[PDB]
């Protein structure tokens, strides 16, 4: 299995912490360098937490599970046409394959794959996910993938992690960000199989991740040629 040693978090003067109705905590940063734009969430995922199946059109994504435990779901089919939803009423629901993550495992998921994750354990677990802006849709406004704007719609800001705020979108807002997001687990899903296709297993893009880590570390060193916010 593929592992990665560390994905650091950009340290912002005022972090963006988002709390969701699923009681997840997202610590989010957006960064840019001359050649690259991305966003990163360092997340705490309670039992049952995690995103329902969804498909990205404007970013490629990495998931990194420092303690394993998190179960990810991933298709072998790609869904290159955002206008064709994988639902009963239209194109058809898809088949997903589960991944039981291991400590420091790195899961790369390119655009157009259907994926999600859940914490199926009885204890809260960490996960990091990284969105790198791809080459699609020059008119899309968010050069980092829009992670900060997207998540601001799905729950309140945490001004105190010691005193969490009350709760009141995850699905309905999504297409504005080039995401087809399901609102219930079985909306886009025909089957779930625990037999992992080798082709999913092999997906990797360490090169771009290493570049984003360089940017993050440069930012944290005070380097003014990159920015995170």
Binding site for its own copies (CB under 8 A): 48, 71, 87-89, 93, 98, 118, 120-122, 183-187, 189-194
Nearer to Cu ion, 61 or 71 (CB): 61
Q: Flag whether 2 is marked binding.
A: yes
Q: Nearest distance from residue 97's CB to its own copies, in Å? A: 10
Q: Flag whether 74 is marked binding.
A: no
Structure tokens at 183: 């609102």
Let me know: does 113 contact 208? Beta carbons within 8 Å: no
Q: Flag whether 115 is marked binding.
A: yes
Nearer to Cu ion, 25 or 179 (CB): 179
Token pair 């655009």 is at which residue?
Answer: 111
Binding partner selected for residue 191 from its own copies, Cu ion, none, CB under the kind-specific 5 to 8 Å limit: its own copies
Where along the sequence are the contacts to Cu ion (CB under 5 A)?
61
Q: Give the count of beta carbons closer than 10 Å to the beta carbon of residue 166.
A: 6
Binding partner selected for residue 21 from its own copies, Cu ion, none, CB under the kind-specific 5 to 8 Å limit: none
Structure tokens at 85: 């939803």
Q: Nearest distance from residue 107's CB to Cu ion, in Å? A: 11
Indicate the annotated binding residues for Zn(2+). 54, 56, 61, 115, 143
């Amino acid at each position: 299995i593929h592992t990665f040693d560390d994905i650091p978090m950009p340290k912002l003067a005022d972090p963006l912490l988002i709390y969701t109705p699923a009681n997840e905590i997202f610590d989010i940063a957006s960064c840019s360098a001359k050649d690259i734009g991305f966003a990163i969430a360092h997340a705490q995922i309670p039992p049952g937490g995690g995103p329902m199946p969804h498909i990205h059109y404007f970013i490629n994504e990495w998931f990194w599970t420092p303690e394993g435990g998190i179960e990810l779901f991933h298709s072998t089919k790609q869904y290159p046409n955002m206008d064709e939803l994988p639902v009963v009423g239209g194109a058809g629901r898809g088949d997903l394959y589960s991944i039981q993550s291991e400590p420091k495992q790195l899961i790369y998921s390119p655009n157009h794959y259907m994926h999600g994750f859940v914490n199926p354990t009885d204890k809260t677990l960490p996960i990091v996910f990284v969105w790198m802006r791809n080459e699609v849709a020059p008119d899309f406004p968010y050069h980092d993938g829009g992670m900060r704007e997207y998540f601001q719609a799905v729950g309140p800001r945490i001004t105190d992690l010691n005193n969490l705020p009350e709760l009141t979108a995850f699905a309905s807002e999504a297409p504005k960000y080039g995401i087809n997001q399901s609102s219930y687990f079985m909306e886009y899903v025909n089957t779930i199989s625990d037999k992992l296709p080798a082709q999913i297993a092999k997906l990797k893009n360490d090169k771009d991740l290493e570049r984003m880590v360089e940017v993050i570390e440069a930012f944290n060193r005070g380097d003014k040629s990159v920015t995170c916010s």
